[PDB]
């Protein structure tokens, strides 16, 4: 009841059953009439849609979920390598918009988890700066799909894939990916793993459940759960629910002196739709369902402060960027070692059949923190003999966010072909000093003296994989004993522990 | 206002006022203190007590504080320079042991905080190591009150006096000393100020709250809070409390087979009496309160898993020794930045009395932790007059263990006379490669190659007192803003930052 996992079984084989134990499992009863005819694969199968020029879908594509249905409530889902929903064709046909931006490849205009440190982030303009400086890698966005583009970078860093599943008799794909700094080269580390599941439950409905997992030692505090929206071509009008279930269109687009529509979701009937037009019931539709509830009293513990959505067509009506954003925010602490989930919906169908669907479902949204049990969370062996025998025993892992336990992953030096695992996943990778772009008379400019940047999507460094995940305490029991995996290593170029690590993390002793 | 701190206010002047904020202050529901019975000094007024042959009070004495009162409740109370007790003069005479190894000069059988990381620490004695090999500096004990001798060494390295402080209108002593690892030469580094405060609460009671504030990055998980003992020959009779307050004799006596007396403190009453004999309520007696609540629940994100006492006669009735060692120990988690306090009592009076007193006050004992809060905490400027102009400006540092704030010390070289101030203690410390004890093949041999020893104690820097606290991070607002201190140094020989403290400390910039 250990098994085996192969360092060599990569996370696009979709086999990693015991990786998502800690999703939660939503049961309906028989409030919904489940999928009879559902497809999935990972063979390259591209959308079709128009795309940004410079844009080839082999360079993004991960996976095709598709709900085969009546020519209202059929939809098609590609997943993208970082996890996100680069294309989304319902009876409006394609929804996400085409990425028209060189730099911006898939990466915004998706749908995605998006989290920041509003203490670390810096969104000043240029001409905060000095002459000739750039704001660059200031932000700090963590984006669920990927990484702009930099100078060297012709496509971007999409967020590593790390594990993922697709469970056939449950109709779901799981995916969990390692977050990237969206703003490169960037000042900050990223300790977020993303992990998304996506699920045909019938009727036009797709499931989908964000999870954000804070391994790393910053706090996030401001999630896009999701970030994304969709092509203004293909769904032109815009409609927020109302208490009691009504729909009322808006008007938010970008502008001057204009950010679009905000508000609490408690305002709201748990819903916005978006249409081919506002003209009639039978227009073709996307409902995205993020609930009505803002339980402050129960997250007090987090400073959970609100949860709205914004909506705004970027732009006027022949903006190339062909984008209506959307998404519903979390102002909520995700503090190092937690783990956040939000279970939302998208819906396709005519409007009048999504804001019917949505008007059953938005009850069913939830969110919370996840803190797995040891007794609970499954185990697997990693063999010695795969890693050139650099320990002195095969080692055991846990596969489930066990509070306070460190993922420990595979990753692979391209140049010299070395593989090794670490849970340092910037162990090796380039660094180099920050050009402070302020003046010395900014009152930023002590804030970035000294400082560097991070270049772990250079290529230089392959992420390969999560392994699993080591207790950070002595777990030895009357049934098993523990050690420091200090204690076992031979070989310490294919078993990494960087000073950091070092004397912290345990394993099951043979 | 933010008041200046002289460079050359000593520790000793007992005047460190704002030093001492962080420290709990005890408020009683029930108990009225007298306040015109209690005086301080640091004028040198020996004990006359007995003492180990080689020893010399001088060497030892810091301060004196005595509760004047009758004969029965009076009681005399000498710290020594690493802020321990060693010498408590009662209605029983001398009650600290006389200190008769000559290897162990008041730095083990004296009242003390004590504290060992579990993780680091092996008492392996030399038939455990290789022929000519010896236990030297294996052990990881930081005592409140100094080190063990060692060859070269003829008198301890007490724990260096930091800041201290008499209130007059409290009736209370407070000193910050930096603890010693005890086992010379040391593989460790010390990360430990000890903070006690000695209060004279009246009626022959001593307050005592000792604060163990974890600066480095080890994690201390075995407490002695306090470690001591008594006399044996002033104290012979050995008692502990029971629950519902009764008192019963216990027998514990180290030897062969026997380590003494060891229960958990809810098996008591919440104290132990010493007393002259053990034949009446009459006889002169030291009460040792230490309660009987083990709070598992409230502090089981430290991880406390139990606190119990140990007493033991240290051999028979004529061993020169004359000793009788008592603790409480608490097994419980003092992580890197926390700070952990246990508040104490010792009483003076007739046996009855002390029971009377006890069974009282045990209720008001506690133990915790304390974070400290920027709005709570005083600010000094040190002058760059003072420093030689080594700055560029004056410098603000704040007065109280802030979570994460880096203490910055005065320091002195011996040989040139030149002071500066670093919060590098080790900066300039002589140290030497560790010979590895153990055998090639022994398990523990790899955890001791690649390791050197700490001579902190040989005389060539002298550690005169803490100056203040900087900030770990950025604390600029509307008013003031904060530069690094690296920014403001001409004098990188006066101000010294060394590697692991470079762009990491931030002061007020003028």
């Known amino acids: 009841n250990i098994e085996n996992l192969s360092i060599h079984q990569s996370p696009t084989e979709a086999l990693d059953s015991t990786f998502f134990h800690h999703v939660p499992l939503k049961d309906y009863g028989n409030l919904i009439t489940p999928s009879n005819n559902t497809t999935f694969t990972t063979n390259y199968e591209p959308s079709g849609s128009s795309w940004g020029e410079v844009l080839d879908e082999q360079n993004v594509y991960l996976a095709r979920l598709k709900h085969i249905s009546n020519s209202n409530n059929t939809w098609d889902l ?24 060189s730099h911006s490849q898939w990466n915004d205009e998706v749908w995605q988890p998006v989290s920041v440190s509003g203490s670390l982030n810096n969104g000043d303009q240029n001409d905060e700066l000095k002459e000739g400086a750039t704001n660059a890698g200031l932000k700090y966005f963590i984006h669920g799909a990927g990484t702009y583009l930099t100078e060297g970078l012709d496509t971007p860093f999409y967020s590593p894939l790390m594990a993922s599943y697709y469970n056939p008799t449950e109709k779901a794909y799981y995916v969990t990916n390692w977050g990237a700094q969206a703003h490169l080269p960037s000042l900050f580390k990223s300790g977020v793993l993303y992990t998304t599941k996506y699920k045909d439950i019938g009727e036009g409905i797709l499931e989908v459940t964000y999870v954000i997992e804070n391994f790393g030692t910053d706090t996030l505090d401001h999630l896009n759960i999701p970030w994304g929206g969709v092509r203004s071509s293909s769904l032109r009008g815009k409609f927020v629910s109302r208490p009691g279930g009504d729909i009322e269109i808006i008007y938010g687009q970008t502008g001057t002196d204009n950010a679009g529509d905000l508000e609490d979701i408690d305002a709201t009937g748990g819903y916005v739709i978006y249409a081919q037009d506002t003209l009639s019931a039978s227009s073709p539709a996307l409902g995205i369902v993020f609930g009505d509830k803002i339980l402050t009293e129960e997250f007090s513990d987090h400073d959970l402060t609100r949860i709205y959505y914004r909506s705004a067509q970027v732009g006027g009506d022949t903006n190339p960027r062909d984008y209506t954003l959307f998404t519903t ?25 999504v804001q019917e669907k949505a008007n059953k479902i938005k009850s069913e949204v939830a969110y919370g923190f996840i803190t797995p049990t040891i007794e609970n969370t499954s185990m697997v062996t990693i063999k010695n003999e795969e890693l050139d025998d650099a320990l002195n025993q095969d080692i055991q892992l846990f596969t489930s966010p066990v509070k306070g336990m460190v993922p420990i992953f595979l990753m692979r030096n391209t140049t010299t072909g070395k593989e090794y695992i670490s849970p340092d996943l910037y162990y090796d990778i380039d660094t180099f000093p920050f050009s402070n772009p302020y003046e010395e008379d900014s009152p930023k400019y002590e ?35 523990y050690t420091l995996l200090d204690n076992l290593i031979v070989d310490n170029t294919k078993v990494v522990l960087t000073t950091e690590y070092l004397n912290k993390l345990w394993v099951p002793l043979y």
Chains 1, 2 share one sequence.
């Open 78 to 101: 590609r997943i993208g390598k970082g996890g996100q929903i680069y294309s989304f064709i319902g009876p409006y046909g394609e929804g996400v918009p085409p990425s028209s931006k």
């Open 329 to 353: 925010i979390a102002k909520i602490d995700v503090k190092p070692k937690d783990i956040f989930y939000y279970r939302i919906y998208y819906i396709n169908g005519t409007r009048e059949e």
């Open 447 to 481: 804030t970035y003296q000294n400082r560097i940047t991070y270049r772990q999507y250079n290529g230089k460094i392959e992420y390969i994989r999560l392994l699993g995940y080591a207790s950070n305490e002595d777990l030895s029991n009357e049934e098993t004993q």
